[model samples]
Target: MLIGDFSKGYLFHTVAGKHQDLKYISPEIMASVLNGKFANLIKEFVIIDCRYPYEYEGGHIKGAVNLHMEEEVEDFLLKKPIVPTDGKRVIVVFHCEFSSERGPRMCRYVRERDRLGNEYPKLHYPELYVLKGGYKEFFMKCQSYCEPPSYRPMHHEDFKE
Candidate 1:
């Protein structure tokens, strides 16, 4: 989907947030990794793609493992792989299409639930971070890198009970 240049340009703007420096990384930066600009960081985060199955199968960051939200949570994630809940160490960054919606919500759900002393404990929670603007933002900014034009437009069709 060809987004207007203005929207595409603005999506890469450095976001201002609580974790500006360490956590809230720009999609531009993530795009770099997708385009093979930052091979090291891809190796670093062990990128996890949380987009739905079909969307993920279409295209995604090179090393990203499709952890479709509907599927069972990663075994490693189920164990709440050790990482700094205080925000440090082997951070877990999630992406879904071009919207970072599910990532933070998943993190928040786990965090909030753990805090309420329910299903899981927080002591083992991974340092969670949502890829700002998701892959949509990435491809928007790096359209030239893609072979041809196509969009991962979120249809919201998966929500039917």
Candidate 2:
């Protein structure tokens, strides 16, 4: 099937590259969501940390759940399943160290699987987002909301202390 702008000329790209368009939620907005600034809206989203377990153990957003970008985790989702606690559709935000690699992969996985139903019968989550700049940026913007206090990166002044 032909895709892209034919008149604009052809540009070769990769399947992974296509994931960039999935969706991106800025660190600021994520911060607001985490800070209880939108307390009522909080229940509408479920944040997932897509980094390796070790990286996630070091630190992650508070209330965020770790789901490694791996086949085993995919299978685990199928077996256990993740449903919204509010009894309504929930937005799923995915993030990694930088939001360049792991986050996009996991976002694409859920979106494609949801659209094609290759694995499940229907959509996995109502929506998905790759946290822009991922944890590094999120931590900078919203430290109080990140967990494992020891894992939080130190600021310039913090380092001096």
Candidate 3:
């Protein structure tokens, strides 16, 4: 049960109201997912890192794909619209330096666009998650899940092009 459009945004079309505030996911749960603990329901997983080149390139989740551009987000995530993740239940997670700005902004951006063109409550990617503390927290607690096994602070002294 859903209603709305690209301009006004999508709503559940019910009395429950639009719970549009994106949800948070813990690093531990993400680690479990990557470890194949929920393969029964989660068939595929895609992580979107919204950091810029320097921050994103320094280090990120092993399988996370960097997507800071709206075009890239649409091209990659929405290209397969009208399909319920092809019945595979693909989970998409988003994160940035602290999950307070870039990551959450991108997360909502993706959801807004997805909801706009979707058929009512039906969406191609409904399972959206935001890393609680972004790369900073994940890299700190779940270093084992990150690639390159290193983290460069967003405000590193050597930060530059």
Candidate 4:
């Protein structure tokens, strides 16, 4: 019943954190996934932008859908249940501001609610994963490779030619 805390950047390679179980994907892998490089492999999977409304509206991965993490997840999942949540493309990768807080919370909610081994019948179900390091990490990774479009405050100002 005691879950050890996980520090950022640490590879979760333990039996408890091993594959098949919820292994924390690394930031690098997450960055790659967002770059569309992993699209060929993950294109079929449903990528969701698990941020507040303002954060999502600011900018997000091209094809990611918005599902505010602050809202009631149970109600959200049930009313508009994602049918493929258990299928090959059922995985729901969550991306919040940072995996330090919102990201971990989101992943924990789903796993705790619907893990395959729980005694209680699945009250709610959806495969869950947090974008390793979350949006902060993703943004930093992208900034390293490319400047975010909105960061271009000057781009909005055209020269008066």
Sort order, lDDT high to low: 3, 2, 1, 4
Clashing pairs in 3: none
Number of clashes in model 4? Answer: 0
Give the worst 10-residue stretch by lDDT in candidate 1: 1-10
lDDT of 2 at 123: 52
Q: So what's the TM-score on candidate 1?
A: 0.55
- What candidate 4 gets wrong by more than 4 Å, as runs, is 1-22, 34-44, 69-72, 82-87, 115-127, 143-148, 151-161
Instruction: Report the C-alpha displacement of residue 11, candidate 3, in angstroms.
Output: 21
Candidate 2 on 1-161: residue-level lDDT in tens?
11111112111121232354666777777777666665664345668887777767778898788888567446644444555546443567788877888888887776665556444434555456678888988887777778874354323454755
Q: For this target, which candidate reaches the highest lDDT against the unseen true structure?
A: 3
Reference-based TM-score of each model: 0.55, 0.67, 0.78, 0.54
Which of the predicted structures, 1 or 4, would earn the higher lDDT when compared with the native?
A: 1
Comparing 3 with 4 on lDDT, the higher-scoring candidate is: 3
**Tens digits of per-residue lDDT for model 4, 1-161:** 11222112222222222234454565566556556564443324445566765666666655566666545564554346435333232345666665445556666665664554344434233345556655655665565432233221112356778
- Looking at model 3, residue 147 earns an lDDT score of 81
Q: How accurate locally is residue 17 in candidate 3, as Cα lDDT from 0 to 100?
A: 11
Point to the candidate with the largest TM-score. 3
Number of clashes found in candidate 2: 0
Native-vs-model 2 lDDT? 0.64
Clashing residue pairs, candidate 2?
none
lDDT of each: 0.52, 0.64, 0.72, 0.49
Q: Candidate 1: list runs displaced more than 4 Å.
A: 1-14, 17-23, 31-44, 74-76, 80-88, 110-126, 143-161
- 55-119: candidate 3 lDDT, tens digit per residue: 77778899999898888888988886544444456568888877777777787887788778866
